[PDB]
């Protein structure tokens, strides 16, 4: 339920190169810090998640060409490839839920379900939809971090300036508010 | 959901007489200040009640005898009796929704719902347990007061504490949460 | 299956005052040490845990008075509150699955699943009677320690004695047993 | 479930003799010491047994011959024969639930059920699988000992080497296990 | 997918005593390394295991007597017995899911589905057979080990050769193939 | 699964001239070499074609003009016409399953199947969409070239700048893995 600015450097090379990037989830910036006896804006014992309807609203006009086409492959396993300022090639585009990136003007979205990371070695994670989802707790500081959406921009001449926005849905149980004098 | 210390002083008097008492409703006691974005520890556009289980949790052992009986008249229109320490009379006696108020060690309890007061000079109140209850919003300072029930305890020779307890239940709606930078 | 001492010290305060307390399970504390090729009294490669029927059968007289009342909150993810020897509110008494917490001579008792946790940082449980709990091993020494109930007892000026009880609930399988000459 | 090893000593008469033997059954064998408040290793007041898997695994190859037959006959009411290192007659021979003993590479195996020894002078037993079996109690020392099968190998020119294996299945009830500090 | 030679040494002792054994599984020995943008041979996000149908294939002919029998327990939740060139026990004798170590030339196999180790000191798993099967992750060092089947075989003067051999299947899904120029 | 830049000369002419192009398949260029035991990185016995969804995502704006159109004629038994920068007709204009070309910003695709060219001379190919599809092998050397679409863009005055796009699906099957020491 956040917004910031990512701008991707645009290249002289001709060859087309992509530019992979990072978008980790965290729960702690949703929510700001408390007071008094509830440091958490929002308490409550036990939260899961569902599904993050994300969406990558692009800035650019229509007018702007330089369209091209990517393939925003889901990542949740923990395994970004080597960040590149111009790659060669597209790592994503071998991929069964894949999905057409289309750009700029052009919206585009993706719908799924994120889960938490266990051990940042061995990195474990829970099916998709199920009722076997593994709940979790409320913590202000010592909060894991969910993995988020492989993007892929593919480069240009001119610059490009994308509003990310993510929507991360919660469904929070067993409240346990403190009411002190 | 707090409690408080409500002892009611002992008389010299032969007569059995009564000592009535006030117990004010108030929102603002169920949560403490908040911090940055979010001065509520419970963020809300709207909310509503239904009802408050209250109950007057006593204190005293089944050895102390000076056992009596009252009407626990409930109160919401805004109407209290002036405060004696030694009333000669029950007010409440007469009523139609009374109850048998068992003192000391037998246990005692209520049901109903409150209602705001809009103006302390004609004084306004829904009607009970309907779907045209008014709704409310949130403040941490300009809120207004709830009526409570309407206690009569009867005097004795012995001291007398109690522990009320009121659980006032909420049903908010329309979440309005902030997460800044 | 086991009891142990638990006081709470009177207090001269006149604000009725909680006191926060502690109770972690431990399943090596059930199991004495074994012998030769059996270090422990129980062998089985795979064992399971239902629910455990909790009750803190009271010591305290009924001519004893300083009766209050409490709220004992289900605690598993592992989020206790500082300990205190007076405080000056109740933070399990906002709850959904509460509870009436009646004393002294009052019985009272709760019903729950545990669940173990893995690691102290992160703190992970297992859904609550569901088949995908996940098993365990058995071990005499490396063992963790499971989440307990959440009390809140109120002072008072007299002392106070309970007798805590649990009867937590085994289902072995898969035995593996050693003869050796 | 344990091994033994009983290695039928050869004989140079040319007559095929017999060479009975002995497998007397043990509960005490099949646990070892305990400890603490637990001296053995497998607690619980009451115990039965159903039947008992019980096997000649052999171990000389097929290639050795000298391969005779034999007759083992089922005992319980305790009345072996005179043991003797070349028998010239098989009193096993005439039975009712008899079962040809082959070996040495052929596989042989029996099934039956065993009970306690009451008096060892007049030798009580219980019927064969029925529901009035006499139950038992758990004792590290003082125990019986169960009648096993009546075994009976030809002797032969060549050594003989088998590995016996039993696999006394046991029905525990009512557990009684002691978890001191 | 592989074999290996595991002889175990004979030993001069009359008693018939064990040699328990080892077999930890892993998943990059039975894939070798890949090259340039393919560091793995089987590229895949996601892999699941269901089943492995191990086997004991014997190298010893039929002449070779010195036949025994054991019980290959099965073993996931980590807890081998101490290794002994010759035990003078059967450790894993007793077990519900047993199976009889039919040897030498006699075949044996066993069936089971094994499970990731999370952490070395507490050692969890998963049940056996069904659709909460947590996931896992393509790693080429990184990688965890697996627990096989708990093996022992029986000592015996003449020397002994097996030759084990595993089928672990694997259920890839979600393929990650690079193409770059 | 990968792009290349194919940009179409403009031309001065004032008639309305095309420019032919070719567009040769290979699968060699949608996989990176190997090591070790396994040279290809998917390593598979055989494996077949089904459909390709090719699609010609355009660059240029929308408030580029210039537009014309055109026939994408299918082309599979091989028999390209003679390249030409600016030809003065559309031999492809005449064809049953043609597809209007709409240019530039508008978005146009198809969908066939490919077939094996045997030999460069005779030239031969399988029907389409048949059960009968010639299977084939996995080679990185020796791999046959399979016929694209057969694409028409005319000329303009401005420059033009298309990111072809195709995603060869495959249906491998009776996979050959090699896991040498």
């Known amino acids: 339920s956040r917004t910031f600015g990512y701008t991707i450097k645009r290249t002289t090379v001709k060859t087309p190169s992509w530019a992979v990037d990072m978008m980790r989830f965290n729960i702690n910036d949703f929510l700001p810090p408390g007071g008094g006896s509830n440091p958490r804006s929002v308490p409550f ?15 650019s006009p229509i007018t702007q060409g330089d369209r091209g086409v990517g393939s925003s492959a889901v990542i949740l396993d923990d395994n970004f490839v080597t960040k590149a300022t111009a790659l060669t090639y597209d790592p994503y585009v071998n991929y069964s839920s894949r999905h057409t990136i289309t750009q700029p003007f052009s919206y585009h979205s993706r719908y799924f379900t994120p889960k938490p990371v266990l051990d ?42 994308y509003n990310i926005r993510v929507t991360m849905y919660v469904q929070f149980r067993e409240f346990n508010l403190k009411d002190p004098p």
Chains 1, 2, 3, 4, 5, 6 share one sequence.
């Open 45 to 59: 014992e036990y939260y899961r998640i569902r599904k993050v309807k994300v969406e990558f609203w692009p800035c």
């Open 120 to 161: 940042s070695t061995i990195d474990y994670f829970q099916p998709n939809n199920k009722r076997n989802q593994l709940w979790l707790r409320l913590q202000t500081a010592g909060n894991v971090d969910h993995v988020g959406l492989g993007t892929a921009f593919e480069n240009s001449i001119y610059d490009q300036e």
